[PDB]
Design an enzyme around this catalytic site. Structure first.
Site, short mmCIF file in Angstrom:
data_model
loop_
_atom_site.label_atom_id
_atom_site.label_comp_id
_atom_site.label_asym_id
_atom_site.label_seq_id
_atom_site.Cartn_x
_atom_site.Cartn_y
_atom_site.Cartn_z
N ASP A 3 -0.96 -16.53 9.46
CA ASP A 3 0.46 -16.19 9.50
C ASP A 3 0.93 -16.07 10.94
O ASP A 3 1.62 -16.97 11.44
CB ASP A 3 0.71 -14.89 8.75
CG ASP A 3 2.08 -14.84 8.07
OD1 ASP A 3 2.87 -15.84 8.26
OD2 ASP A 3 2.34 -13.84 7.30
N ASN A 21 -11.10 -12.66 7.46
CA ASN A 21 -9.98 -12.26 6.64
C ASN A 21 -9.54 -13.44 5.79
O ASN A 21 -9.14 -14.46 6.33
CB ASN A 21 -8.80 -11.76 7.47
CG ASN A 21 -7.55 -11.62 6.64
OD1 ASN A 21 -7.41 -10.64 5.92
ND2 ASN A 21 -6.66 -12.61 6.68
N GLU A 22 -9.59 -13.26 4.49
CA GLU A 22 -9.00 -14.10 3.45
C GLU A 22 -9.56 -15.53 3.44
O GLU A 22 -8.78 -16.49 3.28
CB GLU A 22 -7.48 -14.09 3.61
CG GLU A 22 -6.78 -12.71 3.33
CD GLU A 22 -5.30 -12.84 2.92
OE1 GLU A 22 -4.65 -13.84 3.33
OE2 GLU A 22 -4.75 -11.93 2.24
N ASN A 53 -6.72 -7.90 -0.42
CA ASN A 53 -5.32 -8.12 -0.05
C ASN A 53 -4.59 -8.56 -1.31
O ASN A 53 -4.82 -9.67 -1.77
CB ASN A 53 -5.20 -9.16 1.06
CG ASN A 53 -5.86 -8.72 2.36
OD1 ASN A 53 -6.24 -7.55 2.54
ND2 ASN A 53 -5.93 -9.64 3.31
N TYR A 61 -0.93 -8.94 -3.65
CA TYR A 61 0.52 -9.11 -3.57
C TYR A 61 1.11 -9.44 -4.92
O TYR A 61 1.97 -10.32 -5.01
CB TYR A 61 0.90 -10.20 -2.59
CG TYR A 61 0.50 -9.87 -1.19
CD1 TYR A 61 1.39 -9.22 -0.35
CD2 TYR A 61 -0.78 -10.15 -0.71
CE1 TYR A 61 1.05 -8.88 0.94
CE2 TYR A 61 -1.13 -9.82 0.56
CZ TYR A 61 -0.20 -9.17 1.39
OH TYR A 61 -0.48 -8.82 2.69
N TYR A 110 4.26 -12.52 -4.29
CA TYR A 110 4.01 -13.96 -4.34
C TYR A 110 3.82 -14.46 -5.76
O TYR A 110 3.93 -15.66 -6.01
CB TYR A 110 2.79 -14.32 -3.53
CG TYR A 110 2.97 -14.21 -2.05
CD1 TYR A 110 3.93 -14.99 -1.38
CD2 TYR A 110 2.17 -13.36 -1.31
CE1 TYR A 110 4.09 -14.90 -0.01
CE2 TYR A 110 2.31 -13.26 0.04
CZ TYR A 110 3.26 -14.03 0.71
OH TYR A 110 3.37 -13.90 2.08
N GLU A 114 -4.51 -4.88 2.36
CA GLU A 114 -3.17 -5.46 2.50
C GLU A 114 -2.39 -5.28 1.20
O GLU A 114 -2.80 -5.78 0.15
CB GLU A 114 -3.20 -6.95 2.87
CG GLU A 114 -3.13 -7.28 4.37
CD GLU A 114 -3.25 -8.78 4.64
OE1 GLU A 114 -4.12 -9.22 5.43
OE2 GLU A 114 -2.45 -9.53 4.03
N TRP A 131 0.46 -3.46 4.20
CA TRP A 131 0.14 -4.61 5.01
C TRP A 131 0.78 -4.36 6.37
O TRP A 131 0.00 -4.07 7.30
CB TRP A 131 0.51 -5.99 4.45
CG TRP A 131 0.45 -7.15 5.49
CD1 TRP A 131 1.24 -8.26 5.47
CD2 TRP A 131 -0.41 -7.30 6.65
NE1 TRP A 131 0.94 -9.10 6.53
CE2 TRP A 131 -0.07 -8.54 7.27
CE3 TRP A 131 -1.44 -6.54 7.22
CZ2 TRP A 131 -0.68 -9.00 8.42
CZ3 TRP A 131 -2.07 -7.02 8.39
CH2 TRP A 131 -1.69 -8.24 8.97
N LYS A 171 7.30 -7.91 6.48
CA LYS A 171 6.62 -6.94 5.64
C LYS A 171 6.42 -5.60 6.34
O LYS A 171 5.77 -4.72 5.77
CB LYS A 171 5.27 -7.50 5.17
CG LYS A 171 5.40 -8.40 3.97
CD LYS A 171 4.09 -9.04 3.63
CE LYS A 171 4.33 -10.22 2.74
NZ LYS A 171 4.73 -11.45 3.46
C1 LIG Z 1 -1.24 -15.95 -2.61
C2 LIG Z 1 -1.97 -15.34 -1.43
C3 LIG Z 1 -0.96 -14.86 -0.40
C4 LIG Z 1 -1.70 -14.44 0.87
C5 LIG Z 1 -0.62 -13.92 1.79
C6 LIG Z 1 -1.03 -12.61 2.44
C7 LIG Z 1 -1.28 -12.82 3.91
N1 LIG Z 1 -2.60 -12.22 4.21
C8 LIG Z 1 -2.87 -12.37 5.65
C9 LIG Z 1 -1.77 -11.75 6.50
O1 LIG Z 1 -2.06 -12.06 7.87
C10 LIG Z 1 -0.41 -12.35 6.14
O2 LIG Z 1 0.73 -11.84 6.88
C11 LIG Z 1 -0.19 -12.10 4.67
C12 LIG Z 1 1.21 -12.59 4.35
O3 LIG Z 1 1.39 -13.75 4.00
O4 LIG Z 1 2.26 -11.79 4.51
#
Ligand SMILES: CCCCCC[C@@H]1NC[C@@H](O)[C@H](O)[C@H]1C(=O)O
Ligand SMILES: CCCCCC[C@@H]1NC[C@@H](O)[C@H](O)[C@H]1C(=O)O
Lengths: 597, 587
Positions: A164, A410-411, A464, A466, A470, A502, A547, A566
């Site tokens: 991001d 991360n992720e 994390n 959401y 999303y 998050e 987050w 956010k």
């Molecule tokens: C469907 C999965 C969405 C993942 C999106 C979540 C992201 N995680 C990492 C952070 O650095 C981002 O800012 C976060 C976002 O986009 O605000």
């Protein structure tokens, strides 16, 4: 072997102080024409530390990909004829190569950790040498983080990446020259054990041609333990423990005596024990509950550049809101942050820069390697670079009592076979590089309980999530059900402590809604509140980190209205309504303890 | 057969006096219990016209899917014993069923067109009859526009659809009661031809009465006169907009009836790269619009129309497209009567399953989705639009649909009958179908069944985001590609970028007023280089409400004006271009 510079037989002259000459290189002739030779042409003043992108309000400097040159002259202090002098860069974002007056002396890959070189032979004490830095902001598949450089038909480089936050570059932190005696401490390692909270020791293990003795002085500077041995010791002690609320610090000072000259290094220590048992995270044998934020090193005009007022103010806000912990989201932070965390007893999740190992979290309607784990994408060199990023992060923050857990990445996308092949060796290598702290890897939403592949290789599960943003967008009822179901699924599957590292929603300051629809302050409040009601119903959840603490800059796209919104605070640190929501929950709870509902 | 009520032998009392009793029906027993029997209880006041979603600041009313109940009494005036009296709903968005004291006097499907019924046998003059309306806001694959209803586990309805704007519902327009003499005109048709100082106006005034027609002027002084059928010679322009008046006299010996109907003498046709109004090469300037406004949703309001027309006149627009549905009939009276060029469009939006958000029938044209019934309802919706706006001179082109996906096989089966049939439903107006960005020159399947093709392009926004040099190159090359590929006139019915009022940037980053300005200027320079395109309409005139998602910050923010009608910086930019060119003539 690296330590943070400090005082008495050691002394700094920092070139952080001040303006440097700065230049672009649109055709990359700087290396060919050896620009480090002369004082630059086409040079404009720039401030260090600080990113170069936002400093000139110019979209072309801002969106540049390539090399940039930083150059400054400095007068080397003259009472430094007989001591050893080092040039330390606390961070050069992505890559940097330095010449000390026509002599390349260092080079580094990794934009978030310090790198230094002894420069004694190459300088005349008492006169001024010229420092030239070549900075690269480019990312490929073997950099931490990964990215791809796109070259258009005309050779304009434009950098794409899969995280991001905006790819700010430059000299983000401290640049200083510092002197140690020719017999000097070079590395220190301290480990703390504790039993019934009134009874244990501080193992040590030291390392540079010097016989060493260590005094463990008080906050009162009263000595209560003493050792000697390059291979350290176990100083056994009845103590006052480093706790989350207060963060007591002893001072272990190591004395490196050579028969003529001496060097001594002061290192603060927090006596505390960290461990994981079942689904409980314990600091000093009590179950802790995490509250706080993912953060970012981002701020107006200076990008990721370190700033003292920002650190003072953001900790004042975090203290006010009731946060007790934070995660150094998506790269290692300035060490001044972790020092503050030590003095104040803030619990920290330390994280590497390994973000974007995932090619599924995109904006839509637009040419990537179709196999994330492969020779074209994340391959063996990427793994080695990642392990080296883990080694640098750990070598710098191992002694900090505030660092309570290591985050490998991360992720990442864990669904492909080869995610486990890439990650398992790194998980093992990390445990062997610090067996005293638990290990984590932050897990993305679509790698659900059923599909995730690697979470059992780590001690703590950091999610994390959401839902209602999303997916199930706007739907607090449906999202609540989904969130409960997946949290219970994760607890059933791994019986590990769960931290929600998050959870957050984009919110325009000042947009209000009598409905509770997205982007509104009312929605940020109701969504955080629904998450909090769920967390409170799952025994395994021991930590919540909203987050983002503040709105931050991202690359341009249709998902980001002037960046990521956010934040709980605006980019200029003003609070949205949800800030008071947070302050009510986090100050109304018994400290470090999970909300009894 | 349809026309707007007026007053010389016929007379209205509008029940638009807004406050009706209103209620939800959350367990859907209203039809079963015949709530039209008694006055609705558990009822709250609602304003008609106006959408029902936003009036109450209630998220449960706002997001409701099902039937809602509107009810009001009226005293039928007693000087109405011998005339024929009709109950007219100018629009009930999606579905409506009316009871006039138990006698279910009508039904309508299609939320943007009027429906009226004679209620003389079921009405006693001099007392109050109870009016009950049941309106449904639900969408399936057989509706205009299409949608899908999914029911969650607990019998809760979620309505999903594929168009941007929010699915506002309720009694959006006029509800009027009007009384005609027992021999009454029921329909009128007029056609105008013009040569390169003189020409004729066909009529066909389909009624039980003999016909005499006066063509009175703005002076209402006579210029031609006839007595079903004519063809009359004479001896309406964009900047000026003149209107003559043909007055229809249905003469019977038992009683008489008269109807006043305005007419515009002008001719429209295309060929080469030219769209010509009265044999003159036009340039369309102006907007895609929406019927959207705060609190009232899609409800019609006169102040809103006066103000929005002041705005369009100031900024220099000469034309607008009734985006994604037929507008207020009063819109077109204003446009006829003020000389605005209108690209008229039906509610055929969402025939596409390809650019939703990230984070369904697997083939669009098939029985599961777009089926034969959809063909019928689509044809009927096209025909209702045709019947109500056939006489309006301001309509300059008809839009059969907006933004379908043309790539799946079968689009041309669905479409060919509708283009043939619609051309056969009026040869006096040209026809277009607005096509999406991703059905580019090489990929699109159907651009040749239409007289003009209208492009919605967003390069530099949804693709090449922020990359305005690259986006320029694409827009120029595919614009030239389209000109070579069909040699039709091209109108750009949509181009715009989301812009947050008050977001400013020393770069030119997306979502910023500077960015909207720079992006529009680059597009404008691009069109000035293609002989072929004869129309520019910035995508939306004002910010409007959409359904919730990660793409829409409190709605669509592509407006030149905010939702409270305040101008972004780009507003003045547009004014400079549209005030700086000679009227109807592009640089
Ligand atoms: C469907 C999965 C969405 C993942 C999106 C979540 C992201 N995680 C990492 C952070 O650095 C981002 O800012 C976060 C976002 O986009 O605000
Ligand atoms: C890749 C995106 C393709 C363009 C789609 C753009 C959409 N056209 C239809 C309009 O109803 C929408 O408002 C417009 C948008 O942006 O709000």
């Amino acid at each position: 072997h690296m330590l943070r510079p400090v005082e008495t037989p050691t002394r700094e002259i920092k070139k952080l102080d001040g303006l440097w000459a700065f230049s672009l290189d649109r055709e990359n002739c700087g290396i060919d024409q050896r620009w480090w030779e002369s004082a630059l042409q086409e040079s404009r003043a720039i401030a260090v530390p600080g990113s170069f992108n936002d400093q000139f309000a110019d979209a072309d400097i801002r969106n540049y990909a390539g090399n940039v040159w930083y150059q400054r002259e400095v007068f080397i202090p003259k009472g430094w004829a007989g001591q050893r002098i080092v040039l330390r860069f606390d961070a050069v974002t992505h890559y940097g190569k330095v010449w000390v007056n026509n002599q390349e002396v260092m080079e580094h890959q990794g934009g978030y950790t310090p790198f230094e070189a002894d420069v004694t032979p190459y300088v005349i004490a008492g006169k001024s040498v010229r420092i030239t830095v070549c900075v690269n902001n480019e990312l490929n598949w073997q950099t931490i983080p990964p990215g791809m450089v796109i070259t258009d038909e005309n050779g304009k480089k434009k950098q794409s990446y899969f995280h991001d936050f905006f790819n700010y570059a430059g000299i983000h932190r401290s640049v200083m020259l510092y002197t140690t005696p020719n017999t000097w401490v070079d590395d220190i390692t301290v480990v703390t054990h504790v039993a019934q909270d009134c009874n244990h020791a501080s193992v040590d293990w030291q390392v540079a041609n010097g016989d060493v003795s260590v005094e463990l002085r008080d906050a009162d500077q009263q000595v209560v333990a003493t050792g000697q041995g390059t291979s350290g010791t176990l100083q056994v002690v009845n103590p006052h423990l480093w706790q989350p609320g207060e963060g007591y610090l002893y001072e272990l000072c190591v004395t490196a005596k050579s028969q003529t000259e001496c060097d001594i290094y002061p290192l603060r220590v927090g006596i505390r024990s960290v461990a994981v048992k079942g689904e409980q995270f314990l600091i000093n044998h009590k179950p802790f509950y995490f509250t706080g934020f993912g953060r970012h090193e981002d701020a107006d005009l200076r990008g990721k550049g370190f700033d003292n007022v920002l650190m003072v103010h953001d900790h004042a806000l975090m203290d006010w809101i009731g946060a007790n912990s934070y995660r150094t989201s998506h790269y290692p932070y300035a060490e001044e942050m972790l020092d503050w965390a030590d003095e104040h007893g803030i619990v920290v999740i330390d994280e590497t820069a390994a973000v974007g190992f995932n090619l599924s979290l995109g904006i839509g309607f637009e040419n990537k390697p179709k196999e994330l784990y492969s020779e074209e994408a994340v391959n063996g060199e990427t793994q080695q670079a990642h392990l080296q990023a883990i080694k640098e992060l750990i070598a710098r923050d191992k002694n900090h009592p505030s660092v309570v857990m290591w985050s490998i990445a991360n992720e990442p996308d864990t669904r492909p076979q080869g995610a486990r092949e890439y990650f398992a060796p790194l998980a093992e290598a990390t445990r062997k590089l610090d067996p005293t702290r638990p290990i984590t890897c932050v897990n993305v939403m679509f790698c659900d309980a059923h599909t995730d592949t690697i979470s059992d290789l780590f001690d703590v599960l950091c999610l994390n999530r959401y839902y209602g943003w999303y997916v199930q967008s706007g739907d607090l009822e449906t999202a609540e059900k989904v969130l409960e179901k997946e949290l219970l699924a994760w607890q059933e599957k791994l019986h590990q402590p769960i931290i929600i590292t998050e959870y957050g929603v984009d919110t325009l300051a000042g947009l209000h809604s009598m409905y509770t629809d997205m982007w509104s302050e009312e929605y940020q409040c109701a969504w955080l509140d629904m998450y909090h009601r769920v967390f409170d119903r799952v025994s395994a959840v021991v930590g919540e980190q909203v987050w983002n603490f503040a709105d931050f800059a991202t690359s341009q796209g249709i998902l980001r209205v002037g960046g990521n919104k956010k934040g709980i605070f605006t980019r200029d640190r003003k609070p949205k309504s949800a800030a008071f929501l947070l302050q009510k929950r986090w100050t109304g709870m018994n400290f470090g303890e999970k909300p009894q509902q």
